[PDB]
Amino acid sequence: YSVAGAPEALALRAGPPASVRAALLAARRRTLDLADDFRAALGDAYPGIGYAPELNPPLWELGHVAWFQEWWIGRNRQRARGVACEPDHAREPSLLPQADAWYDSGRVAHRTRWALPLPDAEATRDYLERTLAQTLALLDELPPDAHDDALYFFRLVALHEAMHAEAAAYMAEGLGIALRELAEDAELELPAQRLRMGSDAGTGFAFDNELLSHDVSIEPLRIDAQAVSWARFLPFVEAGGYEHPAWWSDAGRDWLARQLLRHPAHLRWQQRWLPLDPQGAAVHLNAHEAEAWCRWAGRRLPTEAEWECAALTLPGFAWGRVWEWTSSPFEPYPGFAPHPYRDYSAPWFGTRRVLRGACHATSAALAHARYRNFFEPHRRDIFAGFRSCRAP
Ligand SMILES: [Fe+3]
């Protein structure tokens, strides 16, 4: 197997305190640059945006990033236990008396996030600064040979902040807000093989949904070297694909029948409102649109196992442009146990479909071939496309 991601991704999961320190600083630089893009569009108006289920207010997101970090580092009396931390132990107070009432994504009702008496953008930035200074001071106590358990929460809060940065990017694109921050097609042979799927014990940090690592059989197939381009996608649309319900699943038909425009999201072709680049990865497609293109092409989505296997074994397999829908429902691997952030994976099994890879807005520190992204199969706001495969 190849390495599962860029050096930053390996360093954050497996590196020493100095690596996790550099990752926390890089995550915060990215968070504040995105906060600045939002400030340019919304001028620190709270809430700053209308309500939708796929959104949160930008100043709520910033306070939530600080709250999460503080919850799992400075207030956490069992950091050294890593995944054996008792999630509901008695914690020190927050810097902010109402932090738990405002920012705990497990406690605060979604619509309520538009109607909280939050601190202003300046005070929210002050809370971020104070919490990070506390986190880094505690990290600087760890020795260079610190165990995975000792580093566990520092790695977890860096990855969480990466996730919220990407969310800022896809929410910005949804709100039409501008931020500062394909090659030739080919088909690859994936031979019959055994994949050790997921994250092995002592490879460093693993998300709970990556465990247990377990051997799976991979059937021989032929797989796209890169995500499906607009050039490869649009011939399905021009062949009447969004008016032939027979290409679609039952869930897809129900989705399709409920659509005003019988063509992709953000395509008027133009996009966003600039002209459409056929060489760009098809993006803002849901699972139903990806599967219907597959049936039309006589191809299919990979399973996440086929995807992971290809990503780790085939040097011509190029990813990281768009998240890629798999055929795999988000379900536990054998031996799954929720980690101390209990609600990260476990509540979302069944109702979510797995996407693999990463998109242009994913942090280099998060983007990883074992990482399981999970969204309801209708979602289009995410930077999602797909690749296709078929029998050998
Ligand atoms: Fe969060």
Of the candidates 283, 285, 74, 306, the residue with the CA atom closest to the CA atom of residue 192: 306
For the chain, the structural domain boundaries read: 7-174, 187-390
SS3 per residue for 226-264: CCCEHHHHHHHHHCCHHHCHHHCCHHHHHHHHCCCCCCC
One-letter amino acid for residue 368 of the chain: H
Of the candidates 145, 133, 134, the residue with the CA atom closest to the CA atom of residue 14: 145
CA 62 to ligand 1 center in whole angstroms: 10
CA 358 to ligand 1 center in whole angstroms: 18
Of the candidates 170, 177, 131, the residue with the CA atom closest to the CA atom of residue 39: 177
Rounded distance between C-alpha atoms, residue 377 and residue 326, angstroms: 10
Strands (E) across the chain are located at 187-190, 193-197, 214-218, 221-224, 270-271, 274-275, 323-329, 353-357, 373-375, 384-385, 389-390
CA 371 to ligand 1 center in whole angstroms: 17
> How many other CB atoms are found less than 10 A from the CB of residue 88?
8
CA 64 to ligand 1 center in whole angstroms: 7
CA 57 to ligand 1 center in whole angstroms: 13
CA 304 to ligand 1 center in whole angstroms: 24
Residue 300 in tokens: 């299919």
Query: CA 95, 97, 101, 102 torsion: positive or negative?
Result: negative
Total residues found in the chain within this entry: 392
* Strand pairing category for 221-224 and 323-329: unpaired
CA 106 to ligand 1 center in whole angstroms: 9
CA 205 to ligand 1 center in whole angstroms: 18
Solving technique for this entry?
X-ray
Rounded distance between C-alpha atoms, residue 375 and residue 308, angstroms: 18
CA 161 to ligand 1 center in whole angstroms: 8
CA 67 to ligand 1 center in whole angstroms: 9
> How many other CB atoms are found less than 10 A from the CB of residue 193?
12
Resolution (A): 1.8
Q: What class does CATH assign to 187-390?
A: alpha beta
Q: Note whether 367 and 6 are within 8 A (CB).
A: yes
CA 156 to ligand 1 center in whole angstroms: 11
Compute φ and ψ for 294, nearest 5 degrees: -60, -45
Residue 325 in tokens: 């829908």
Residue 44 in tokens: 């620190």
CA 296 to ligand 1 center in whole angstroms: 38
CA 208 to ligand 1 center in whole angstroms: 16
Compute φ and ψ for 93, nearest 5 degrees: -65, 160
CA 234 to ligand 1 center in whole angstroms: 35
CA 164 to ligand 1 center in whole angstroms: 6
Rounded distance between C-alpha atoms, residue 310 and residue 356, angstroms: 11
* Strand pairing category for 214-218 and 193-197: antiparallel
| H-assigned helices in 259-363 | 287-297, 304-313
Rg of the chain over CA atoms, in angstroms?
A: 21
CA 339 to ligand 1 center in whole angstroms: 15
Of the candidates 220, 224, 252, the residue with the CA atom closest to the CA atom of residue 386: 224
Q: Which CATH number fits domain 7-174: 2.20.25, 1.20.120, 2.60.120, 1.10.10?
A: 1.20.120
